[PDB]
Design a protein around this ligand. Structure first.
Ligand SMILES: [Zn+2]
Ligand SMILES: [Zn+2]
Ligand SMILES: [Zn+2]
Ligand SMILES: [Zn+2]
Lengths: 286, 287
């Protein structure tokens, strides 16, 4: 029902006063996100001025929101597009937080070696792109997110083992290099010197117990300024859920794909010939 | 001795008629400062309804009195709690009144000029911005700032002429209503205010007339709160509680406010820590 979501969308665009220009061209097409991001930015500025982001670009934050909102409107109106997932993310079952010292790449193969890399990198060829300079700092980052998710979702059936990772950056919208956004582990310096027996906020306790964050950046840091931390991405989902419920009450079913490895994600080394347009009917003259 | 302080606490709460609810649950815990702030407010109304406060919130004066009172009660009962300092204050031996034109941030080091003065670890930072090794100290007017330190020294001299040691220290609050983590300053912002009317007129009053400026301790970052109190008033808040005690108990127990020694926990935090967001869903993802 294209009309349904088409309308529910303009309502939000009216309420949060989006430029009639942006407001007029939106037709709920596969990748019209600017308007929805506009709605989310105005909402944030209104009901959430105290939003602090840790290792995340503000522009990236409101863009992810737009993607998650586009997902909901589509899921609400029951609108599908043959080859387009709105969120642009996927759920990776990161088994990096179980056996200590044992990290794993997108392939499902244990990272091989202080440093760690994709088995097929003993990066190029049939690799995924995952490399870690300091393996220790990496597992800390994966443990932290596992903690954060349990603090946020205390008693849940599943979810703590997955990782809401983005599949596309501002570029994936073929090219050489990594096909997925790079995930570089960052360290939390100040968190390292706080007494763990602090305030009852368990989400903050996660960072304190594991001072490192998984930060997703552009596939190849063409490239772009895409930057966003794991927890901030999760917040981006939760906040859009809030926004939705605040206006429509019931949250429609919106499923974000479970990541399954395939050759299409492989690190691309050689290019493929692309044709340069020619304003000629015939190739040669003779 | 918990029971010893409980008896003494009950007395004060009875005499100064504290609300039944408040004084009922009171167990002398480190966070229970409400009842003690009450005892003080009463005593102020029915004993000093003519108190004046220059650049100070009456709410803050009561809160501070409650702390100092708690401190005395604990000293009297010989009860200390790990991870708790009742006064929420520290004695800073600032050397901002020794050499003319020379100030010194909470590090014990001189201050770089920008007439503005800033912490040396902000040498690379633009004027008012703070680095991660900063103490958060900054003064637009270095001169005025020293005048504020000169006034507090003089005030302290007037009140204690034959004081052996103590004239070089500064009683200052280490925690506002907020830190009692967050970005920015980790200690109340020390801002110097000018006493305009002082320029046109007992020793205490001579202090403000000779050095027309006052040190004001606001919130760490003006989370946020309405914490406001001047240096002399804070000193008074201490003195008054001492009275309230003497007037009610024969002896005054020893109470030592800790001496400020710079440490890592006080440096300006620029990077934040991820805080969750309330989601009314058991499961995080829809499968
Ligand atoms: Zn791999
Ligand atoms: Zn990119
Ligand atoms: Zn300093
Ligand atoms: Zn405050």
């Amino acid at each position: 029902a294209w009309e349904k979501g088409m309308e529910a969308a303009r309502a939000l665009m009216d309420k949060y006063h989006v430029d009639n220009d942006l407001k007029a061209n939106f037709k709920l097409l596969p990748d019209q996100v600017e308007a929805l991001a506009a709605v989310c930015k105005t909402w944030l500025n209104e009901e959430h001025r105290g939003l602090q982001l840790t290792f995340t670009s503000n522009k990236t934050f409101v863009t992810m929101m737009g993607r998650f909102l586009q997902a909901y409107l589509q899921s609400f109106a029951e609108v599908t597009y043959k080859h387009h997932e709105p969120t642009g993310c996927a759920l990776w079952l990161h088994r990096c937080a179980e056996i200590e010292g044992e990290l794993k790449c997108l392939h499902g193969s244990i990272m091989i070696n202080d440093a760690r890399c994709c088995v097929h990198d003993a990066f190029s060829g049939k690799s995924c792109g995952m490399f870690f300079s300091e393996g220790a700092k990496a597992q800390v980052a994966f443990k932290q997110i596992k903690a954060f998710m349990q603090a946020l979702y205390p008693n849940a059936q599943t979810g703590h083992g997955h990782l809401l990772m983005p599949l596309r950056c501002e570029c994936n919208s073929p090219f050489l290099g990594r096909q997925l956004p790079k995930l570089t582990p960052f360290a939390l310096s100040n968190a390292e010197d706080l007494d763990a027996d602090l305030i009852s906020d368990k989400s903050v306790l996660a960072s304190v117990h594991h001072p490192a964050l998984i930060v997703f950046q552009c596939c190849n840091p063409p490239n772009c300024d895409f930057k966003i931390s794991a927890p901030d991405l999760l917040n981006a989902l939760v906040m859009v859920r809030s926004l939705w419920s605040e206006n429509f009450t019931e949250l429609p079913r919106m499923v974000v794909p479970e990541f399954k490895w395939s050759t299409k994600h492989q690190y691309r080394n050689v290019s493929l010939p692309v044709a340069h347009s020619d304003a000629r009917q015939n190739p040669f003259d003779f």
